[PDB]
Design a binder for this molecule. Structure first.
Ligand SMILES: CCCCCCCCCCCC(=O)OC[C@H](COP(=O)(O)OCC[N+](C)(C)C)OC(=O)CCCCCCCCCCC
Ligand SMILES: CCCCCCCCCCCC(=O)OC[C@H](COP(=O)(O)OCC[N+](C)(C)C)OC(=O)CCCCCCCCCCC
Ligand SMILES: CCCCCCCCCCCC(=O)OC[C@H](COP(=O)(O)OCC[N+](C)(C)C)OC(=O)CCCCCCCCCCC
Ligand SMILES: CCCCCCCCCCCC(=O)OC[C@H](COP(=O)(O)OCC[N+](C)(C)C)OC(=O)CCCCCCCCCCC
Ligand SMILES: CCCCCCCCCCCC(=O)OC[C@H](COP(=O)(O)OCC[N+](C)(C)C)OC(=O)CCCCCCCCCCC
Ligand SMILES: [Cl-]
Ligand SMILES: [Cl-]
Ligand SMILES: [Cl-]
Ligand SMILES: [Cl-]
Ligand SMILES: [Cl-]
Ligand SMILES: [Cl-]
Ligand SMILES: [Cl-]
Ligand code: NA
Ligand code: NA
Ligand code: NA
Ligand code: NA
Ligand code: NA
Ligand code: NA
Lengths: 311, 311, 311, 311, 311
């Protein structure tokens, strides 16, 4: 239980693989997700080599305590992973094939710019620290990188689970470190957002524009103010299931824009009533008739502009 | 502590059984449930066999550490199950009888299409990985698959707990794996939904339709807008205790449909008032008289159509 | 570390006792409560017999690992109890006096039918499984069953903590099981419900009935609709701190009934206004005058009927 | 590892001390707080005594496993404390000086009667159970009872941390117990409540009284009903961050009282409008003029009476 | 094992370093944050020294159990840190080089005075307790104090991670304690607050001021009361994601100030209507015309004064 000694000076290559069994709990606010997978490790330890003719056995099995196992860690985990060693198998040349099943909560930031029409790349960073005896370097065994078909992430579509085969080798606290990037590409299922948030929010907005076909100040006040309160409720509901991004999001922009439409509707409703009382309803009539075209046209154009900027 | 060697080449059959003690916390949003149950395992290990005459006993009790025990895992669990070995017994022929009491949090997706009138099938997937020495295969001891009568899942009816006797055998990372499916059939207790959500939601809708017996634009605006806000409250309350499904649900469809009825009520209320001011209340009267029959008839038909599609 | 041998054939009697130290976290929605308590166990194991003359000590102290201890489990726990052995004391005859302090989240269903004026029976089920060597049977040492006086369950009154002395002996997976029932009788402190939910809910209802002393449709609409929205808020607040019962509760029935009173108030307010416009205010006047007596009388009469059904 | 033997028959005195390192998470609803502190224990074990001149060392250091340590427990804790032994020091005469750093969630009930102007006494109960060999009794080393100056309990002022030096000695399950009471006196920082809950709640009430300077039934209805809804929101916000007390609180009384003021305002608004329609506005005028003085005077007196009762 | 003996009487210097790997979960209400990092420790233990010539190795590796390791603790943690020893390396002169990776929940109070435009200093306090044999003293190895570039704290900007090199040496429970202060300077990303809370809150305020261009008491009541309710919603949303500070905050002051503007708007709306009915609309007109300038001017000045006080 010391690292296998080098034949020349070559670094020790630990081949890795992650096969996702379960994928759950994608918290958008926390930018965390829970994972359940197999972690497979392989390396050559010549000290464990044997003759398969005389030994009679093709493969020897070991307990973790018995042999040297490289200390593999995840970079972006909340706490150290919960692992259970499934199997350790040594080949006649000394090739070790370690398999463990684990659970871990991962920290991977999300890009909310195109929400709820966004895609994400979740990351799992494998890392190994070199020892004074020899330098450990990570590799990807593409044959042992995969995902169970049943893997389902609620409200998301799992596109691919790949690994960037070239590790990031760098110095950290005067020792070499080999980092691997496992990428899980997922896209958001936006269907639900349409009948639940998008269309209800557009209807409460259009209801506010019926004030352009009424001369009743008392009714218009109620119309524009009541629907504005519904939009505040909408804004809270949306913003409370999202983190505070230092950048502007698509849904962020739209919600904001709709507040300006309410502010300008209130100004129109006020102007129309002022002119009515000022005994000049002809100006009030032409402003109201204009608003009937202006408001939907400007709304539809502002939206085209916004969608264009964000997509 | 190596797997029992094969007489020929036949795979080792581990007979299983799950007897549910407590069933709780069915989270609809998370699509998870917690289970507390006995796991029983039985397999032949000829090396453990003894003569009852010489040994003076008919059963031999062992500690887990003492003998080979197959590594059984649950597929769809959040974290590895919390288990406590109840007993290990060996018959004279080497028929091992293992029993453990466990608790796990299980991932089992739900079909919200007919919610709150839905039935579900919860799954418990048992899996064993074959070893280099020999191939392990799972079986169901139907005599040891059950549930306590006291088992109660709050707001659900437990219909049955059965096991699909033929395991799913497949290759995973060049080793055989034997998977068993334990199914817990349940159906939702929808009674509470009727006096709490369904009838209150229909009453706030009918209150909106009293606007078809009023000419007061100011009162109508208030009646349709206020009741619309109550429906938004309803929609939030409902949608916050459900996951974001990529498919349309029955409750989803109904809530959505009711938004259209509110939008058309607002349009009618607007049209009637416009015509009043335009000094043609006869047109306004005939449209309002029509709405009194149209709105309930279209509502009741749309509902029959919807129920028909979903059931 | 195997069970003690019988002198004849008699089952091994493990005497039990539970003394409650801290009772807390009664979750009505989950139907769970947390309990911190002493668990005391006593049995005779003649193998541990000693002559204090030789041994010098009159009672021997042991570590759990050192001697055979019966596997006692709780049936209705979420997860296995967190226990810390306080003391294991053996007297010369081999009597083991085991004491441990534990914490556990117990699953005990509640009857919400008379809520908030309900009383409950919480259950703690002790179980022991028989071994092939000899049958273990539970007993209650009434001297060691109790509760600390300081034990306080927030918003509840603790009446009694007793044990059903005769254990439920039954077969389970071809072995005998001895089950004991510890009952904790409690009753809800309903005082807070009166000034916080009951009286505020009756006042918002009576405010709606002031519409029977007004002819202003616009004011009546606002009165009945605004107070109805307050009742929806009330209903949500109440129902979100309760589980979805398949049966009708007292508070459930009352909340429901009050919705009908709002629906009939809206109908009256509509009918009165229609008749006003139809230029027949004498009919409208007599209906409104009737409603002033009808509404409180029917409300008081329906409440008497409801209280009578539920209590 | 047995308790130190008595010279005569005197009970073994374990001197205790708690020094609070960090104090946090005071949950008012749960009536729990999280603590992090040093627990110090000191007793004489003559067996461990050594020659100071002949052993060369003045103080011997031991590992917990090596010597007898009294089993000290907290009464009012959720689960057993998480402890890490800092140091064990044996003096030449056998005085053991044990130190450990621990964290626990303590259950200490609160008196909400004068909330948010209340002061509290948090309790930490230390307990030891006597053994068959000899009786253990607790004592307070006042020199080792304290708190770090940096100790901060958010929204509270820490007044003192003292210990009631005379332990509660009593019998429990036929063995002596020695209980000690550690008291943490704190008083609530009520400043925030004034600009956030108190003044906003009084303004929405005074806004409802502007109805006494209006003859517009439709406006008064809106004024009194709208502000009443704001008070319901207030009441929910307040009551959801407090437990259901079986006694009346000061904030409880005030919130309740304000509901009666709203009920009487609605009655006045109704009476004034009835009289207007009944063509007798002179009676309506005198009732309204009276209400302008009556409402603030009765409000200010009811408050003086309430404050007097509660303080 | 015991601490390394002094050559003269010099205290043992443990050099420390913290290199932040991942920084997450900054709870403003709890004033806690979660940290994942490397802790590096280095001291000289002459007993572990070896001749590299005869040994053949230029360094020696040990298991924690094998050698003396100083008991380093964090002061301001919730619970004791979860640590995993990465590596222990010994140089030929007996210089130990210890590295561990840990995760802990750190308590560090925040200054909410300039929120959401606030910057903070998070603290990590390292402490070691001296022993009777010798005094242990902490030091900072500035070369081993850092942070990964990828370290991201959601909704915050990480400015610097430094250490106050001179430790706080003081007595605690009659033993000397060496305390080190690690400071993490961060500053809040306030962008999101502008389109989500600030601008929506100003628009609902300006909408209430359109009442100064209306004579309709009914429409004014609705305008000022409805927008006031939106401000209450705002106030709750803001205050529920903040702790109850015993001091006034900037956002606290602004929210409060806006309540006074609503109160004075209600008074103006009341005064204007009273004067209208009193048949003196000229006074009402001049008060209303004044309010149109007074309200924005006083609002803009009050804000300049407030910003000036807080910044
Ligand atoms: C109120 C505002 C109305 C919202 C309009 C849709 C927003 C949009 O423009 O959506 C566009 C996205 C498509 O995105 P994509 O393929 O991921 O982008 C990758 C873009 N490249 C090429 C730069 C890599 O979503 C959709 O499929 C639209 C379906 C929803 C229709 C909603 C109707 C109501
Ligand atoms: C607003 C609209 C009101 C909702 C109408 C009921 C929905 C429905 O149509 O419900 C239907 C389901 C029955 O479902 P089932 O037997 O599980 O389906 C299996 C169907 N196969 C196997 C035939 C395909 O529920 C009920 O028993 C109706 C009781 C609810 C009464 C609601 C009163 C109002
Ligand atoms: C709105 C509806 C108003 C609620 C009316 C009270 C319900 C009731 O009648 O409550 C009755 C329960 C008593 O219950 P008990 O002794 O536990 O029942 C066991 C009964 N057996 C053994 C006879 C079957 O509460 C009370 O003491 C009444 C005090 C509450 C007054 C609330 C005033 C407002
Ligand atoms: C609307 C209601 C307004 C609230 C009025 C204050 C309540 C009260 O009367 O508060 C009184 C308590 C004082 O408490 P004490 O000295 O601990 O009591 C010890 C009592 N003995 C003598 C019985 C032991 O708080 C204060 O210091 C009041 C300061 C805050 C004023 C907030 C006004 C807004
Ligand atoms: C309604 C009230 C509107 C809020 C007004 C901004 C408050 C402010 O003036 O905030 C000021 C802070 C800057 O703070 P700083 O440099 O950290 O302070 C250190 C101060 N010294 C000099 C004492 C060390 O924010 C900003 O960058 C201003 C951008 C916010 C614009 C808001 C748009 C609406
Ligand atoms: Cl890890
Ligand atoms: Cl498992
Ligand atoms: Cl296959
Ligand atoms: Cl295979
Ligand atoms: Cl248990
Ligand atoms: Cl404890
Ligand atoms: Cl620590
Ligand atoms: Na190893
Ligand atoms: Na084994
Ligand atoms: Na044992
Ligand atoms: Na000990
Ligand atoms: Na209104
Ligand atoms: Na050590």
């Amino acid at each position: 239980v010391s690292p296998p000694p080098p034949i020349a000076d070559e670094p020790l290559t630990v081949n890795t693989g992650i096969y996702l069994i379960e994928c759950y709990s994608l918290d958008d606010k926390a930018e965390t997700f829970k994972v359940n997978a197999f972690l497979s490790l392989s390396w050559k330890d010549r000290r464990l080599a044997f003759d398969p003719v005389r030994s009679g056995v093709r493969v020897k099995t070991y307990e973790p305590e018995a042999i040297w196992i490289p200390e593999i860690r995840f970079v972006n985990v909340e706490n150290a992973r919960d692992a259970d060693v499934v199997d350790i198998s040594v080949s006649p040349d000394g090739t070790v094939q370690y398999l463990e099943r684990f659970s871990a909560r991962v920290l991977s930031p999300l890009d909310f710019r195109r929400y709820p029409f966004d895609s994400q790349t979740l990351h799992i960073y494998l890392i190994v620290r070199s020892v004074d005896t020899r330098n450990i370097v990570l590799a990807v065994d593409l044959e042992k990188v995969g995902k169970n078909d049943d893997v389902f992430l609620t409200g998301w579509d799992i596109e691919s689970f790949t690994a960037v085969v070239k590790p990031a080798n760098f110095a950290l606290e005067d020792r070499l470190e080999s980092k691997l990037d496992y990428q899980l590409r997922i896209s958001r299922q936006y269907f639900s957002y349409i009948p639940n948030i998008i269309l209800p929010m557009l209807f409460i907005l259009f209801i506010s524009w019926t004030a352009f076909w009424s001369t009743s100040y008392e009714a218009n006040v109620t119309l524009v103010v009541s629907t504005l309160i519904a939009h505040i409720a909408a804004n809270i509901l949306v913003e409370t299931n999202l983190p505070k991004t230092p950048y502007m999001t698509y849904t962020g922009a739209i919600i904001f824009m709709i507040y300006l439409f309410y502010f300008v509707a209130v100004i129109e409703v006020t102007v129309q009533h002022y002119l009515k009382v000022e005994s000049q309803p002809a100006r009030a009539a032409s402003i109201t008739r204009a608003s009937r075209i202006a408001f939907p046209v400007v709304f539809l154009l502002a939206n085209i502009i916004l969608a264009f900027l964000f997509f």
